[PDB]
Write a protein that binds this ligand. Structure first.
Ligand SMILES: C[C@H](c1c[nH]c2ccccc12)[C@H](N)C(=O)O
Ligand SMILES: O=[P-]([O-])[O-]
Ligand SMILES: [Fe+3]
Ligand SMILES: [Fe+3]
Lengths: 115, 118
């Protein structure tokens, strides 16, 4: 049985700290996605830095009950306010970041890099 | 301009599942995705399996996560063998393998996501 428990894996990605990855491209002989992120309640953090990926990134915002988490996604000079649950596509090459406005314990934003 | 999906989750029928499963990523989104992602918060599912044992023809990953490590625990049945996963954990279910999970323990904010890998 293939079980990975040494998680998250910190990987450096404009981002101050290594991002915490729960799926990496090399797991299980190869995955078509990578998945990073974490709980938002301790992330509610005055600044966020813009950055670009060479692949598409999907933001996946979720909370135990709908509406309990809220983020601002900055995408190429446009501010977008999203309420959980939400999924937003960041096209490869686009400068982007997000800020957590509100989040209950158990709210997550995952960044999913699509190969 | 920006592609945003908020009509979520998308209920989709999955083999063996009593009710439609809540999907947050589907294969047709954004012109095509190599994965589908379904699942949700486990705090009300302790003791209550969402599905009978079932088989997919694609690989499925269980992604178990909680705000603090250890706050969520599920039992995965994999071709008649029980495996206990403690958050955070990722488990690969090879295509063709009979499987299901039972929630053993979950705080508010514990999730199990099933990721179908094309
Ligand atoms: C991986 C980055 C991320 C998304 N959600 C997160 C939650 C906590 C810590 C990092 C993240 C992503 N590339 C971004 O654009 O921020
Ligand atoms: O019900 P989901 O974990 O596939
Ligand atoms: Fe990013
Ligand atoms: Fe399954």
């Amino acid at each position: 049985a293939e079980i990975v428990t040494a998680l998250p894996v910190p990987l450096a990605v404009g981002h101050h700290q290594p991002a915490p990855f729960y799926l990496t491209a090399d797991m299980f002989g190869g995955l078509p996605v990578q998945l990073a992120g974490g709980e938002l309640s301790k992330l509610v953090k005055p600044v966020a830095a813009p950055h670009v990926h060479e692949v598409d990134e999907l933001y996946f915002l979720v909370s135990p009950e709908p509406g309990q988490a809220r983020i601002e996604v900055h995408l190429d000079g446009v501010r977008h306010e999203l309420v959980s649950p939400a999924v937003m596509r960041i096209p490869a090459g686009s400068e982007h970041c997000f800020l957590t406005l509100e989040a209950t314990v158990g709210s997550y934003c995952f960044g999913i890099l699509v190969g």
